[PDB]
Amino acid sequence: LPTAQEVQGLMARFIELVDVGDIEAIVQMFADDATVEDPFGQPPIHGREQIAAFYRQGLVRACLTGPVRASHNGCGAMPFRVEMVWNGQPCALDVIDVMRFDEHGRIQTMQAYWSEVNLSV
């Protein structure tokens, strides 16, 4: 189980991969049975391919907007901003990903909180 410090490291690593757009590298960070709920409120996405599909569908710039809050039970929450093009126009989306990592430092749970209210032009 990653330590509070390792969680900070992994979560930041995740943002870096989304930012560069390395789907393969992003997918590899997920445990086998990892689930993704993005946005939180919608059906969880399960499986390597579906997740890769989800990220390819999505990937865009992403960067932390605050430090990773990490716990001692391999979990963490981080605030970030996604820069993308929507309705043919440059937009921003504020998100908070809550993640639970496993013993191998792989992502078991990803929950991204955000909705239209967090959408900005």
Residue span binding a second copy (CB under 8 A) among the ranges 20-28, 39-47, 55-63, 82-90: 39-47
What is the size of the binding site for a second copy (CB under 8 A)?
29
Q: Which regions of the chain does DSSP assign to beta strands (E)? A: 30-37, 45-46, 61-64, 69-70, 75-86, 89-101, 107-113, 119-120
| Nearer residue to a second copy within complex by CB, 48 or 81 | 81
Counting contacts by CB under 8 A, is residue 121 touching a second copy? no
Question: Which long-range contacts (C-beta less than 8 Å, at least 24 apart) are formed by 50-58?
Answer: 51/27, 52/23, 52/24, 52/26, 52/27, 55/18, 55/23, 55/26, 55/27, 56/23
Counting contacts by CB under 8 A, is residue 78 touching a second copy? yes
Residue span binding a second copy (CB under 8 A) among the ranges 20-28, 49-57, 88-96, 101-109: 88-96
Q: Which of 21, 44, 47, 79 binds a second copy (CB under 8 A)?
A: 79
Counting contacts by CB under 8 A, is residue 96 touching a second copy? yes
Is residue 33 classed as helix, strand or coil in its secondary structure? Answer: strand
Binding residues for a second copy, per CB under 8 A? 4-5, 8, 39-41, 65-67, 69-73, 75-79, 94-96, 98, 113-118
